[model samples]
Target: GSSITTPEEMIEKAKGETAYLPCKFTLSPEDQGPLDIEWLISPADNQKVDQVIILYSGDKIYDDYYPDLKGRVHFTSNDLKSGDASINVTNLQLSDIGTYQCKVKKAPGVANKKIHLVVLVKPSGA
Candidate 1:
């Protein structure tokens, strides 16, 4: 009984810049337990493989789940109860472009969204 409030199909950003992947969930009426959020990525080359980049559960954040993304990603809101499950990625790189999924769950309440990110390379002489 939950759905994504803001759906961002795709995002584009230049290398060395920041990108915001928007994802907001509408809570269900029978919600229980602490809010749980997970962010995963599927590489462009291998969509079959999905890797966990960040996670929030039991009132704590797990940002170190992925080594390459550690220290470069954060939840848009410090307080998730505000219904903002979006993620901010800093210092973008070419390899950072891919498909990302955001999942939010609180017991019976659950919602998810998938977004594609394209990292644009700077002009050779620019």
Candidate 2:
């Protein structure tokens, strides 16, 4: 009774564009609860260690986001009771490229995903 409905996915975007890191996951048989959802980001090989971007629980949201990422991240669905853990990062930057860890509580246990967000820069003048 600890199976994930979905798996990790890829999100690619250009610099300065809004990037969507989808985490639409649920438990088999489905459920609702005062879930604990957390989002973290870290560079390759723990270069800077993992940083908390956001945390939601008990119908409330909290932020321990990175310095440059303050006020630039949010939940697109905003509901973890029924297991919707998608996140949207605005004002993308090269520094935004990292592994996004999304954790949410489900029925028997929890469902988590590690999405690799790669941000590309557009060349100047075509």
Best by TM-score: 1
Error of 2 at 50 (Å): 1.9
Tens-place lDDT digits, model 1, residues 1-126: 567765547888887677887777776557765788888777685444578887778877666555746766677787788777777777877777778878887777767777777888885321
Q: Please, what is the whole-model Cα lDDT of each candidate in the order they appear?
A: 0.73, 0.67
Candidate 2 stretches with Cα past 4 Å from truth are 27-33, 63-68, 123-126
Question: Which portions of model 1 show Cα errors greater than 4 Å?
Answer: 45-48, 123-126
Among all windows of 10 consecutive residues in model 1, the one with the lowest summed lDDT is 117-126
Highest lDDT among the candidates is held by which one?
A: 1
lDDT by residue for model 2 (1-126), tens: 554544676788887777876666555545554466777787554466578877666666555344536656677785555557766777777777788787876545677877777888774311
Q: What is the lDDT of residue 2 in candidate 1?
A: 67
Looking at model 2, residue 23 earns an lDDT score of: 68
